Write a protein that holds these residues in place. Structure first.
Motif, short mmCIF file in Angstrom:
data_model
loop_
_atom_site.label_atom_id
_atom_site.label_comp_id
_atom_site.label_asym_id
_atom_site.label_seq_id
_atom_site.Cartn_x
_atom_site.Cartn_y
_atom_site.Cartn_z
N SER C 134 65.72 32.82 -90.35
CA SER C 134 64.50 33.32 -89.69
C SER C 134 63.80 32.24 -88.83
O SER C 134 63.33 32.53 -87.70
N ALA C 179 59.93 34.14 -88.88
CA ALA C 179 60.48 34.24 -87.54
C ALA C 179 59.36 34.27 -86.50
O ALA C 179 59.43 33.59 -85.50
N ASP C 198 49.45 40.74 -86.84
CA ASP C 198 49.92 41.01 -88.19
C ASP C 198 48.89 41.89 -88.92
O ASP C 198 47.73 41.95 -88.53
N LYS C 203 47.85 35.46 -93.01
CA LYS C 203 48.78 34.81 -92.11
C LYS C 203 48.19 34.51 -90.72
O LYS C 203 48.57 33.52 -90.08
N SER C 220 46.69 43.78 -86.44
CA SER C 220 47.66 44.74 -85.90
C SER C 220 47.24 46.21 -86.04
O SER C 220 47.92 46.99 -86.70
N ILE C 267 63.93 40.63 -82.86
CA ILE C 267 64.60 39.87 -83.92
C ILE C 267 65.00 40.77 -85.11
O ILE C 267 66.01 40.52 -85.79
N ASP C 270 68.38 43.47 -87.08
CA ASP C 270 69.20 43.48 -88.30
C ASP C 270 68.71 44.48 -89.37
O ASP C 270 69.46 44.81 -90.28
N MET C 301 71.60 36.04 -84.11
CA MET C 301 71.00 35.00 -83.26
C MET C 301 71.37 33.56 -83.69
O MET C 301 71.78 32.78 -82.83
#
Ligand SMILES: NC(=O)C1=CN([C@@H]2O[C@H](COP(=O)(O)OP(=O)(O)OC[C@H]3O[C@@H](n4cnc5c(N)ncnc54)[C@H](O)[C@@H]3O)[C@@H](O)[C@H]2O)C=CC1
Ligand SMILES: NC(=O)C1=CN([C@@H]2O[C@H](COP(=O)(O)OP(=O)(O)OC[C@H]3O[C@@H](n4cnc5c(N)ncnc54)[C@H](O)[C@@H]3O)[C@@H](O)[C@H]2O)C=CC1
Ligand SMILES: NC(=O)C1=CN([C@@H]2O[C@H](COP(=O)(O)OP(=O)(O)OC[C@H]3O[C@@H](n4cnc5c(N)ncnc54)[C@H](O)[C@@H]3O)[C@@H](O)[C@H]2O)C=CC1
Ligand SMILES: NC(=O)C1=CN([C@@H]2O[C@H](COP(=O)(O)OP(=O)(O)OC[C@H]3O[C@@H](n4cnc5c(N)ncnc54)[C@H](O)[C@@H]3O)[C@@H](O)[C@H]2O)C=CC1
Ligand SMILES: [Mg+2]
Lengths: 373, 373, 370, 370
Positions: C134, C179, C198, C203, C220, C267, C270, C301
Motif C-alpha cells: 500500500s 495508500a 475520509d 486520520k 467525505s 488503487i 484490487d 502497481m
C-alpha cells in the motif's frame, strides 16, 4: 422517532446542531425531523435547505421541545429554556454541568435524559465530540489574543510576530491537549514565541516532535507556571479534567505581577475557568480588567465562525445522533460505551460522578440505569 | 542644531519618531533635542526616560515646531498642524504626498524643506525606511482580516485555518513586496489558503521558494485578479509604485460579485488605496460596507503596536537623522543619493516627479537645489 | 529446514520473495536456502549476490519446489505451477483466493499447507504484509498520475506543481489510509494542491498536523466529495472497507462533469475499483477513456518498482519467515495469532471463512488444525 | 494595433502564444486581437474563452498573418509558413536562427521585423522568456525520470522516495540554474536523495540554504561528477554555458560504469546535450539505450504540459507584448534594451552578431536600425 432541533439562544450563538445532510440521513432512516424556522440561518442554511432535506419547519421553540423525542442542541439550555425540559425526552448537547448548579438543577427537576457531548469518551480516553470545538476555540484564542494585544484595544501594544530586529510577543499556553495544541500552533504561525505547559509529558513530547522544538515545552508546576506567566504578553488557559470544574491555576496575586497590558484568554471558562479572576463573558462584551491585564472569557467561542464550526461539530456528532435516533438512549448507550460516558441526567438522577463531587449533589451509578434484566 | 520631536496627533497614533538611544546619540554629537511633554508615552517612553537621555522637555507643540531646525515625525502633518510648518526647517517624516494635494499645498506654501521617509531609496531600488512599517502593516493585515471574518464582526464567519475536515479561509494578497509578503506569511501561518499576485515574477519566484509552493502565486492581470477576488474570503491590497498614487485594481463592480461578508484590507490606503471603494478610516471606526463586503482602510496601521513599531522605525531612520543633524539637509543629500531621493519640498518647489505628475503640479529637479556654486 | 524461492512466472512480475539479507539470516540460523537461478534479476539481485549470502543456486523451478520445506513466493501459483504444489510443504505468498476458484482448488487438491500474506493480521486489525505494498502503490499513484496528466499521454496537460505565477495541479485523494496518505504526501512533494477525503476524522486530523494544513482535508460527505472531484485534475482512489468490495464513490455521472483530460487512478482496483467506471488495465494499455477523462487501474502497481517492492515486502515477511523456518507452521501459528490469521489451506481443508463463503466451499475452522 | 495569434503547426506543438488574460489586457488598451479558430485547444483554451476576453476568432491562418501588425507565436515559422511572412509586420516568437539557415533566409527575404524570445535579456544577463520554460522543463525532468525508472519502462525499477526501511532513488542533477534547481526541488519532494553539482558555488549555497542541507551539493569537477553519476539511479543534465553549446560532461565510458537500468534525462539536448550519448528523442520514442542505461532526450519538454507552459510563457512575454503593441517595435526597443537584445531581422538585415557569425551572413548592428 421525532428528532428536534431548535434555534440556539445563547448570546451571539450562530451555530446549529444539524445540517441538511444529517436531516436527509435521519429522514432516510424513517425518522421525523422538526426544526425551528430560522435555526440554520447563522450558519447560512436556509429553511428551504432544511425543507428539501426532509425536515418539517415549525414556528416556535415551544413546539420543537414539546414534540421531539430526541432534542439536539449546540449549547446548554439557559434560564429561559428550563421550562421546556421534559421527562422522557433525550437531550444531546454541550452541558458543562460542573460549571452550573442552576443548569444541573433544571435538568434533574425536569426528569429529562441528557447526554453531554463533552463527556462522550472513547477507550483511548479521547473526547471526539469536544475535539472539533477545542480545535476551533484554540485557533480562535490565538487570533483574539493577538487582536487584544493591540494598544488600540487597551493591550500592551506588541505585534504577535515582531519584525526583523524587534522581539515578538511571548505567548504561554497552559494545557497541551486539543485546544492548547491548536492555540500554540496558530500563535507560532503568527511568529510569536510560544511556551506550552502540561503535566502530561507525552503531550509535551508530541509538541516537541511536531514543531522540532520551535514550540517550547515546560513541565507544568506552580513554580514553572508562575515564572512563565510573569514573562508573558499573552496567556491562553486551556486545561481540562474531563467533565469537571477547571482547576484555578492562575491566581489574582500572580496576575498582579504581570506586565501591564498583558492579555489572558481562558478557553477553560466553559468548565468554570482556570484563572482565579475568570468569569463568563459574551461576544458583545468579551473582556474585563484584572489588575493591569485584560481577561477574555467567552464560553461559546466557536459561535463566531459558524460556517467552520457548525460542520466541524456535526461531522463528529451525526454518527452518535443516528444511533440514538434508531435505538433510543438505553440501547445506544449499552452498545456504545463511549456514548454511555456522556450520560449526565436521567429521571432526576445525576449520572456524572465528577459533576456530583464538584457541585455537592448525590451521585447515581450510570451502570444502574443501564443494568440488564 | 536643534532637533524637535512633537507628539503625534493622528487618530490613535501611539508611535514617536525617536527613542532615548537616539536622543542620547544626538546629544553626544552636540545637538539639542526638544521633545513635547508626553510624546513617547504611547510607546512606554516616559518624559523622565527622554530627559535622562539628554532631551529638553517642552510643554507645547507650538514651541517644538518654532524652535526646531530638524523636525522628526512619524506621520504627515494634518490640518491643525499646517500653520506650524515653517520656512528654514527640515521636516523628516512619512508624507504620502501623491494622496493629499492639501498636505502638498501646505508644505509648498509654508516654504519648508521636507524629506519623505517612504521615498528614501537605495540604488538597488529598496525603500529602507518604509520597509519596517510595511512589515508591521502586512503582519497586522492578516490578524485584522482574520478578526473581521468572524460573524460577530459582520464577517462571513469563517475561521482562517479551518479545522481538520473543514475548509480554511481563502486569502488573496495583491502585491508580493514587503507588506504583501508579510501578510501572506502570517495568513499562511494561521492556516489560510493564500494566493499572492504580482506583476513582478521574481517576487513570485521568491515566495514559491520560501514556502515550497504552499503560498500560491499568480501573475497579476485583470483577468486573474477578478477570478481570484471573486473566490476570496479576505483580500489584502498591498501594491506600491514608489511615491505614486496607488492604482485602482479592485473595482466596485468586481466587489459586487464577491462572497457576502468578505473582508478587504487596503494597506495601500496611505497612497490613495488600490480598491476603488477605499477611503481613509481610523482605528476608532476602521470598517465600512461596500456592497455586501467590509472594507478596512487604516492609513496608520503600525500605530496599534507601538512597542514593536516605534523601535522598528527608529532602528532604520536614526542613521539618516544623524547625517541630517550633523551636516544639514543639502550636504547630507549631496553625500547620500538614497537620502536625496526622499527630497519632497523646498522653498515652494516640489522635488518629487511622481507626486508632481499625479497632482498635476509643476515639478522641479532635485538636482537643481543640490547644484554646487 | 530448506527454504525455497523460485522465480516469479506471472506476466510482468519482476519481484522475488527474498533478498540477500533474509538469505543471510536464514543461513546463520542453520537453514538451507535454495534459489532458482535468475530469480532476483528482475529486482537487481544477481545470483552472485544471493550465493555470497549463503544461498544454493538451483537451475530449475522443479528442483526448488521439490526440495523446499518452506516455499516463499510473491504472487499466487498459476496454472503451469499447480502440479508443483505439494503435501507437507508450506507455501507462503499473496494468494487472493476469493478471486480464483482455480487457485483455491489447486491448493486444496494438492494437500499443501498455505498461508496468505494479505490476511496475516495483528490484534489492532492492521495487515503488516499488505502495508508495505500500500505504501509503494500510494507513492506510485502520484508519479503515474503526474505522467498521465501530460498532454502527450492524452491528459489535460498540467504539470503537478505548476511554476511560479501558474496554477499547480489540483489533486484529490479519496481515502487517508496507508495508500492515500502516501499518495497525498508524494503529490504534495511534487507541488500539487492536495485535498484528502475520509470518513475517519482521526486520520484527517493526523494529516493536518503532519503537513500543518498544507495537505487539505475534507470530511467525505457526498457534497464535499462531488465538489472536490469536479475541481480535480487528478483523482486518486485509495479507499478500503474492511471485509468488503470497494464502494463505488465516483459515479460515471460525476465523471461526465470533470475537466477534460483529467486523470483518475484507482488503487482500489484490487477490490473492484472505487470508481463506477473502473476495470482492470495493464502496463501495456494502462489507461482508457471514460467520458472526457482518463482512467488508470493497474492491479499490480508494486511490480513496476521491483527493486523497491521486493525489499519493502521481504523486510515485512522476514520475522514470519524466520519463525516458520525455525518452528514449523503449526507451532509458529500457535505462537503468533497474527500469522495464524493467514492460514489458508491444509491437507484439502479451506481455513478461511471469507474465501469459503465467497466461493461456496466448505469451511474448516483453523482451530481444528492447530 | 492588430495583434494576431495563429495556431502552432509544428508536430506535437500544442501551446499557444496568448491566454484570455493577455487578450483582455490588449483589448482593454484598445488593441484588436485576432486568433485562429482552435489555436488554444491544445492548452485547454476554447474559442469561447478567447472570444469572451475580447478576441476576434478567424477561420484561417492566412487571415491572421495577413491582418496582424504584431504576430505572436511559440515556435519558429516552418516551411509551410514562409509564404505568410510580411514586410511591415513584427514577429515575436522563439526563433533559434543559428539552427536554421532556411528560417533565417525566409525571414530576411520577406523583409519582416522579428524579435526572438530567447535572446531578450536583462542587464544582469538573465533570459526572462527562456526562464519559465527552464522551470517547466526542470520540474518535468523529475517526473519523467521517476516514470522511466519503473522496470516496466525498462528502468532499474526503483521508486523515487523508497518507503520506510527501503532505499530511495539516488538522483544527480548537473547544473544548479533554473532547470536544475527545479528538477532538484521536485525530485527531492518525491522523496529521492538528491545531489546537485555546479561550478557556481553561490548557486550551491542557495540550494543549501533553501532546503536546509537536505538537497546535497557538490562542487562540479570531472572527478566529483564521475563518482556521483556511478552511484545514481537518475541523472538529470541541466547545464548551460552562455554563448556556447552544452559541454559533454558525461562520457559514454562513464555511462558504461553506471547501474543497469539507470535513467539519464538530458534537458540540455536543445543545445545539443551534456551527455556524450545524447541525440534527439521524440514523444513517440522518448528513450533509447546507451550501454545498460536509458537516455531521455526531448528537445521540447514544455510542449508536454501546454496548459502550464502556455501560461508560464505568455505571463513572461505579456509586458513585452504590451510595449510592442502600445508603442511599435522601434520605440519599444529604444526604451527597453532587454527587448532590443532580441532583435533578429528588419528589412533584410540580420541583427544578431552570433547568428551572422554562425551562418556566414553580413551583420547589421541593431543600433543602426534604431
Ligand atoms: N470556550 C469555548 O468556547 C470552548 C472551550 N473549550 C474548553 O477547553 C478546555 C480544554 O479542552 P481540550 O484541549 O479539548 O482538553 P484536553 O483534555 O485535550 O487537554 C487538556 C490538557 O490539560 C492538561 N492539564 C490538566 N490539568 C492540568 C494542570 N493542573 N496543569 C497543567 N496541565 C493540565 C491535561 O494534561 C490535558 O493535556 C476544556 O474546558 C474545553 O471544554 C473547548 C471548546 C470551546
Ligand atoms: N496603511 C499603513 O499603515 C501602511 C501602508 N503601507 C503601504 O503599503 C503599500 C505597499 O508597500 P510595500 O509592500 O513596502 O511595497 P513594495 O514595493 O515592497 O511592494 C509593492 C508590490 O506591488 C507590486 N505592484 C505594483 N503595481 C502592481 C499592479 N498594477 N499589479 C500587481 N502588483 C503590483 C510591485 O511589483 C511590488 O512588488 C505602500 O503603499 C506602503 O506605503 C506601508 C506601511 C504602513
Ligand atoms: N493497485 C494495487 O496494486 C494495490 C492496491 N492496494 C489497495 O488499495 C486500497 C487501499 O489500501 P490501504 O490504503 O492499505 O487501506 P487502509 O485501510 O490503510 O485505508 C483505507 C481508507 O479508506 C477510507 N474510506 C473508507 N470509506 C471511505 C469513503 N466513503 N470516503 C473516503 N474514505 C473512505 C478508510 O476510512 C481508510 O482510512 C486497498 O484496496 C488495497 O488492497 C494496495 C496495494 C497495491
Ligand atoms: N529540453 C527542453 O525542452 C528545454 C531545455 N532547456 C535547456 O536547459 C539548459 C539549462 O537551462 P537553465 O537552467 O535555464 O540555464 P541557467 O543558466 O539558469 O543554469 C545553467 C547552470 O549550468 C551550470 N553549469 C555550467 N557548466 C557546468 C559544469 N561543468 N558542471 C556543473 N554545472 C555547470 C551553470 O553554472 C548554471 O548554473 C539550457 O540548455 C536550456 O536551453 C530549457 C528549457 C527547455
Ligand atoms: Mg506605455
Amino acid at each position: 422517532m421525532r428528532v428536534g432541533i431548535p434555534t440556539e439562544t445563547k448570546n451571539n450563538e450562530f451555530r446549529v446542531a444539524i445540517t441538511p445532510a444529517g436531516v436527509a440521513e435521519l429522514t432516510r432512516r424513517g425518522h421525523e425531523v422538526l426544526i425551528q424556522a430560522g435555526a440554520g440561518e447563522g450558519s447560512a442554511i436556509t429553511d428551504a435547505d432544511f425543507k428539501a432535506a426532509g425536515a418539517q419547519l415549525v414556528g416556535t421553540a415551544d413546539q420543537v421541545w414539546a414534540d421531539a423525542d430526541l432534542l439536539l442542541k449546540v449549547k446548554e439550555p439557559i434560564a429561559a429554556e428550563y421550562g421546556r425540559l421534559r421527562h422522557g425526552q433525550i437531550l444531546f448537547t454541550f452541558l458543562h454541568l460542573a460549571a452550573s448548579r442552576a443548569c444541573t438543577d433544571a435538568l434533574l427537576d425536569s426528569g429529562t435524559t441528557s447526554i453531554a457531548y463533552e463527556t462522550v469518551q472513547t477507550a483511548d480516553g479521547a473526547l471526539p465530540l469536544l475535539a472539533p470545538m477545542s480545535e476551533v476555540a484554540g485557533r480562535l484564542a490565538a487570533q483574539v489574543g493577538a487582536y487584544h494585544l493591540m494598544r488600540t484595544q487597551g493591550g500592551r501594544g506588541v505585534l504577535m510576530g515582531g519584525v526583523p530586529g524587534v522581539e515578538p510577543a511571548d505567548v504561554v499556553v497552559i494545557g497541551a491537549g486539543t485546544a492548547g495544541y491548536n492555540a500554540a500552533r496558530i500563535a507560532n504561525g503568527m511568529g510569536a514565541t510560544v511556551t506550552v505547559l502540561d503535566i502530561n509529558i507525552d503531550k509535551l513530547r508530541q509538541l516537541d516532535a511536531e514543531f522540532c522544538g520551535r514550540i517550547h515545552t515546560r513541565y507544568s508546576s506552580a513554580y514553572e507556571l508562575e515564572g512563565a506567566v510573569k514573562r508573558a504578553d499573552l496567556v491562553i488557559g486551556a486545561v481540562l479534567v474531563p467533565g469537571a470544574k477547571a482547576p484555578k491555576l492562575v491566581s489574582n496575586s500572580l496576575v498582579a505581577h504581570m506586565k501591564p497590558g498583558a492579555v489572558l484568554v481562558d478557553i477553560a471558562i466553559d468548565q468554570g475557568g482556570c484563572f482565579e479572576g475568570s468569569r463568563p463573558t459574551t461576544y458583545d462584551h468579551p473582556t474585563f480588567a484584572v489588575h493591569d491585564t485584560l481577561f477574555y472569557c467567552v464560553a461559546n467561542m466557536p459561535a463566531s465562525v459558524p460556517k467552520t464550526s457548525t460542520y466541524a461539530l456535526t461531522n463528529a456528532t451525526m454518527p452518535y445522533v443516528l444511533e440514538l435516533a434508531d435505538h433510543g438512549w438505553r440501547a445506544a448507550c449499552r452498545s456504545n460505551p463511549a456514548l454511555a460516558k456522556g450520560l449526565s441526567t436521567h429521571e432526576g438522577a445525576l449520572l456524572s460522578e465528577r459533576v456530583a463531587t464538584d457541585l455537592g449533589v448525590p451521585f447515581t451509578e450510570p451502570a444502574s440505569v443501564l443494568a440488564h434484566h
